Write a protein that binds this DNA or RNA. Structure first.
Ligand SMILES: CON(C)Cc1ccc(O)c2c1C[C@H]1C[C@H]3[C@H](N(C)C)C(O)=C(C(N)=O)C(=O)[C@@]3(O)C(O)=C1C2=O
Ligand SMILES: [Mg+2]
Ligand SMILES: [Mg+2]
Ligand SMILES: [Mg+2]
Ligand SMILES: [Mg+2]
Ligand SMILES: [Mg+2]
Ligand SMILES: [Mg+2]
Ligand SMILES: [Mg+2]
Ligand SMILES: [Mg+2]
Ligand SMILES: [Mg+2]
Ligand SMILES: [Mg+2]
Ligand SMILES: [Mg+2]
Ligand SMILES: [Mg+2]
Ligand SMILES: [Mg+2]
Ligand SMILES: [Mg+2]
Ligand SMILES: [Mg+2]
Ligand SMILES: [Mg+2]
Ligand SMILES: [Mg+2]
Ligand SMILES: [Mg+2]
Ligand SMILES: [Mg+2]
Ligand SMILES: [Mg+2]
Ligand SMILES: [Mg+2]
Ligand SMILES: [Mg+2]
Ligand SMILES: [Mg+2]
Ligand SMILES: [Mg+2]
Ligand SMILES: [Mg+2]
Ligand SMILES: [Mg+2]
Ligand SMILES: [Mg+2]
Ligand SMILES: [Mg+2]
Ligand SMILES: [Mg+2]
Ligand SMILES: [Mg+2]
Ligand SMILES: [Mg+2]
Ligand SMILES: [Mg+2]
Ligand SMILES: [Mg+2]
Ligand SMILES: [Mg+2]
Ligand SMILES: [Mg+2]
Ligand SMILES: [Mg+2]
Ligand SMILES: [Mg+2]
Ligand SMILES: [Mg+2]
Ligand SMILES: [Mg+2]
Ligand SMILES: [Mg+2]
Lengths: 206, 155
RNA sequence: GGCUAACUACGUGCCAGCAGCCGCGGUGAUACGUAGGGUGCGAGCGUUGUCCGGAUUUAUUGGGCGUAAAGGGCUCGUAGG
RNA sequence: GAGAAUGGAAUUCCUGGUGGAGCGGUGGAAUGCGCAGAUAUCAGGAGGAACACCAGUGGCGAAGGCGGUUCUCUGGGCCUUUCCUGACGCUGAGGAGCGAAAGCGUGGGGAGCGAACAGGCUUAGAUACCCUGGUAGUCCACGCUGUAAACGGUGGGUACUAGGUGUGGGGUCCAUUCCACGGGUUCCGUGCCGUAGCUAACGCUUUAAGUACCCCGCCUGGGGAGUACGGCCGCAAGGCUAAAACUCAAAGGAAUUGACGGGGCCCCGCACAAGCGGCGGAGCAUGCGGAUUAAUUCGAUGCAACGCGUAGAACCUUACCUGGGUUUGACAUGGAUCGGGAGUGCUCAGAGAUGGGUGUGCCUCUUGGUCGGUUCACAGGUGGUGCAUGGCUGUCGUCAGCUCGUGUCGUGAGAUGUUGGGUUAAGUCCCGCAACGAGCGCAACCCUUGUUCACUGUUGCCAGCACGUUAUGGUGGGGACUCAGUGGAGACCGCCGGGGUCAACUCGGAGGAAGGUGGGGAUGACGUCAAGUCAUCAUGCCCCUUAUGUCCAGGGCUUCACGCAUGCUACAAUGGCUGGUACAGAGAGUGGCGAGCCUGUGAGGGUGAGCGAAUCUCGGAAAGCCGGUCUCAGUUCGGAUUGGGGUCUGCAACUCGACCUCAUGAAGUCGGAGUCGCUAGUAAUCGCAGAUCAGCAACGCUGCGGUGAAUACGUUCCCGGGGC
RNA sequence: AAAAUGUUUU
RNA sequence: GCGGGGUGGAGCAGCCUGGUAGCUCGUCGGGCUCAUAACCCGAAGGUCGUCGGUUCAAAUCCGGCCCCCGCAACCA
């Protein structure tokens, strides 16, 4: 209601932009194609689990880094799915796409995949308290210095909306040098959708 | 304020007449942030003063300020169900400020055409002992004397 | 619905109605109406009436009286204990 | 306790002396009293009532209660070693007596006080509080009444069960006295603390609410109701005894945590105060309510809606209205099926949508890209619900807080930590502490500004050197200065002195560009308001489907008896007009910024370099200074309105654009009650730039620099908040 | 120094 | 029959006599308040029951009428 996005707050200070290109007469159209690419990838690769999509451009050539928990879905069988998604990318944009897919070393520590999993459990109708506790425990088993999860909505299929949250460790949202990874997802249930937000304090950075 | 007495900005001296009084006068005229206009007015008034009398304009301004300086003035007090007018002695800085404010306001209220020698006329009249500024000083002193019975409420 | 063994869908929309108490119905009704499913009983099953129990809620077994209901305004003194 | 006499002060009244204008009373007043001499002051007198000091932390009484002194009469208590009687004790239904004050009866008395009452004030009213008067009553005698929060809300008697410590009464003992000071000890009171124990807790605890025994009174949910009926008592008021119908599902006890308080203590904020400038009046701009309309689309409604979504409504936007079209649809995705063009140029009809012409007409390949229909699936919705939601935001609030783990306390909610003392902008620290710790907030890390160093030197800069058309750092060149932008340094109460038990902090000083957080921004804890948004997006459910979809033209969102709100320009001389002349910053630019020249009164037009920009352009900064002029005039102020002639953008300026020019010259004389902003480069004012944008109703918004104040004693009051 | 009040949502 | 009364929304002044229609409350518009009441600041509001006459001029003077009151309506 009144809290800033941690990633935007720390943008330029500790964290970096997801897109790296320069253009001053096409800026809008490159932004539009980037939006198309990201929407297409998110809409067609939910199963893999997308941590981030990172876009680079050199000269009419686009490079897409896809940070995914399980790139097995993206690569398919012997790269067939990778080739088909690349081909759909040329079909969508019209430019030469070089697509590479990267792992996440600690999916239980990356907040975006944590929100992915919590929302998936909520959609599969798992008790939200149990799901949040499992995610929290897994994060601290991995070794994060602080977890904070908040699920808001018609939790448990109820009528009134709740804002149930869990946290322990330390999550200094106000500290800029604090490396805080923020993830968000929406569990699509038979009763609207639940917003799941996750903050994970990786540690302190210069 | 609650915390304590806020610091006062030091008063500069007038380059021409070498007196902080004239600088305070121009800073009191000082409408709209036009320092140059205000001190053009003030210098014109002081030169008119030295024209109409041989004595020094800074000295005549000083004499006017002493003739307009109030010694005590009454303030509202909320004791009981009725308001009182408690007379309070006035410190030298406060009384110089009051004299300057009254001088400037009544100069602005004078009937003559231009502000410069409206202020000049008011200054000369005050130095002599006449004018609206001196009348207001006498009236405030008179009302303080009338309400002198509440000098024991001072804190 | 809970006490109380056994739950969902459809219809209705503080209406129609339910209820022993708490309460339910105001558009997602496990509480109304129907259906499927279930549970308790079974030539019976429920409801009403009445009595005892739970009620130590008249306490002999087995309670209490400063503030929760409860020490007489105070003493003298008769029967009684 | 009863009776009688009696003492002094004070009030009131009376008489006299003196003296003269008020007195009295309150928050402020008035009623009232007073020159017919009050109030005040002194003397003398009368009368009624209550007894300062002693006097409480105390004494006595069965309770109610009891305070001048003296005498008379009288009740009970306490102690004592001997003495006497020898269980004669305890309690006590019914009964009887006593029983504050108010009240009643007969008579007396009546100073003060004072229900009722009268008047004055306050008030919306004031049958009240407050003020001036004032009768019963208060007093006495004899009766009556018989009730009180008549309470220790605790019946009487008895025995037992740690202490500690005040105090009242009687003995007795001791040392020095041969008093008494003192200590003990014993018996009886009366308080406080406190163990065991008890209690729901609060608390009680040898004066039990503990452990026990004896007797009495009494309770059985809350109301109805201590009411009705009956009876008894009373002169009366009323008292005593004492139900039922009906009705509710609670009523209640103690305590916990919050919130609130016209509760306290301590604090803070432009919250007041001290100041400066406004708003509310006028004209216009803009938003909204209302009204109106075919439509005046929808959302926002105390602060925290109202120059807000709108960072741009002539068409478009557009969601609204009239009317004209369309139906797998304006747009998606997938199967089939007939295909080769799709898609378009020119024309015709039409307000346009659209429809009809005419030209042009796939690339692979024998089975794709692309489209067509017919369907089939399906799409579409700014339609509903922000009280089904996600997301995002306001807000209390930059407020100093909000919690957790473990321990501990309590039956429990819960508490402790987080209270206390000091300090701080701060739950910031310090000291002590049944707490020991941690977390989110505070702070810091980030951006910007203030000083400085190194590095680099163009498109920036020009100190020393060489020319330049006269001229322009224009030129070669230069790392000095400025600046640009990367990386460092710098501030930490770090140093010195005082205060501070110390300790945190605090005061002063030096150094320094900067000193005690240096200025500003970003950052908004747990949560609150079912706060806003289904209309940015997303979405549960519901609703529309030849229409609530969708296309188009025109209209509307711009209405106008009105009301509010935010602004702008003013009301003039610190000003208007006019000529000259200085000094910025931050920004924008290729359908763009446009110089220069020519043309026009001007908006502009015509040509048109340069610049994707530290280069070129926007560009002029304005206020200011200087010269002239106007001379207090509803004006040479003000620039609304209205008439004429235009320019530009755009398919198109009627509704409904900006601008130019000519003429016109409205209200307005500083604005009622009320109200707003601001503590320093701030307020006040002055111009400039950008977003959106063809153009612009922009005076809005977000920034930028120029000029540049007054004041803050202080926390009493108003508003908001913080700790206990 | 006096200074009142706060219907019925679902 | 005698005498009085009829004036904004209400209740009341203006009547010897002609010329200027007032106070209180209420209505309406704005403040104060979270909101209402109260209070604060501004505004509208009756051509005087009706007909006619007097007069330069009528709420005012005179008459008729309508309405509301009061009084009287008596002696056998
Ligand atoms: C009416 O339906 N029933 C009766 C209840 C109701 C039901 C559903 C709703 O969704 C809302 C409401 C009440 C309204 C009241 C609104 C009002 N406001 C519009 C001025 C207001 O007075 C405040 C406020 N000052 O705080 C609010 O709270 C408010 O805005 C709000 O949230 C509301 C709702 O939306
Ligand atoms: Mg069961
Ligand atoms: Mg249903
Ligand atoms: Mg029984
Ligand atoms: Mg029973
Ligand atoms: Mg019991
Ligand atoms: Mg007992
Ligand atoms: Mg009781
Ligand atoms: Mg008793
Ligand atoms: Mg009795
Ligand atoms: Mg006996
Ligand atoms: Mg007697
Ligand atoms: Mg005393
Ligand atoms: Mg005592
Ligand atoms: Mg014997
Ligand atoms: Mg009796
Ligand atoms: Mg009596
Ligand atoms: Mg009597
Ligand atoms: Mg009598
Ligand atoms: Mg009285
Ligand atoms: Mg008593
Ligand atoms: Mg009792
Ligand atoms: Mg007894
Ligand atoms: Mg006993
Ligand atoms: Mg004792
Ligand atoms: Mg007890
Ligand atoms: Mg009775
Ligand atoms: Mg209580
Ligand atoms: Mg002020
Ligand atoms: Mg105005
Ligand atoms: Mg509207
Ligand atoms: Mg809507
Ligand atoms: Mg809401
Ligand atoms: Mg709404
Ligand atoms: Mg901070
Ligand atoms: Mg709401
Ligand atoms: Mg919708
Ligand atoms: Mg509009
Ligand atoms: Mg550019
Ligand atoms: Mg400040
Ligand atoms: Mg007769």
């Amino acid at each position: 209601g009144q809290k800033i996005n941690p990633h935007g707050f720390r943008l330029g200070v500790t964290t970096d932009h997801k897109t790296r290109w320069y253009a001053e007469k096409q800026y809008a159209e490159l932004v539009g194609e980037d939006v198309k690419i990201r929407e297409w990838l998110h809409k067609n690769l939910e199963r893999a689990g997308l941590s981030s999509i990172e876009i680079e451009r050199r000269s009419e050539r686009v490079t897409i880094f896809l940070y995914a928990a399980r790139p097995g879905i993206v690569i398919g069988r012997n790269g067939a799915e990778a080739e088909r998604v690349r081909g759909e990318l040329e079909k969508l944009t019209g430019k030469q796409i070089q697509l590479n897919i990267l792992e996440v070393k600690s999916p239980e520590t990356d907040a975006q995949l944590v929100a992915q999993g919590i929302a998936e459990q909520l959609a599969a109708r798992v008790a939200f308290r149990r799901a949040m506790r499992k995610a929290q425990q897994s994060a601290m088993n991995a070794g994060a210095l602080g977890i904070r999860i908040k699920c808001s909505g018609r939790l448990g299929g109820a009528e009134m909306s709740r804002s149930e949250g869990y946290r322990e460790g330390r999550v200094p949202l106000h500290t800029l040098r604090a490396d805080i990874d923020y993830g968000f997802f929406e569990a699509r249930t038979t009763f609207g959708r639940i917003g799941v937000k996750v903050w994970i304090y990786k540690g302190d950075v210069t | 304020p609650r915390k304590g007495p806020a610091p006062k900005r030091p008063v500069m001296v007038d380059p021409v007449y070498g007196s902080p009084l004239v600088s305070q006068l121009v800073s009191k005229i000082l409408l709209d942030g036009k320092k140059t206009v205000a001190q053009n007015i003030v210098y014109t008034a002081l030169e008119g003063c030295r024209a109409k009398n041989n004595t020094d304009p800074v000295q005549t301004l000083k004499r006017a300020l002493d003739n307009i300086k109030p010694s005590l003035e009454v303030k509202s007090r909320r004791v009981g169900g009725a308001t009182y007018q408690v007379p309070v002695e006035v410190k030298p800085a406060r009384q110089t400020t009051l004299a300057m404010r009254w001088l400037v306001n009544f100069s602005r209220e004078r009937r003559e055409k231009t502000m410069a020698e409206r202020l000049m006329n008011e200054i000369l009249d005050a130095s002599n002992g006449l004018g609206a500024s001196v009348k207001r000083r006498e009236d405030t002193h008179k009302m303080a004397e009338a309400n002198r019975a509440f000098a024991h409420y001072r804190w």
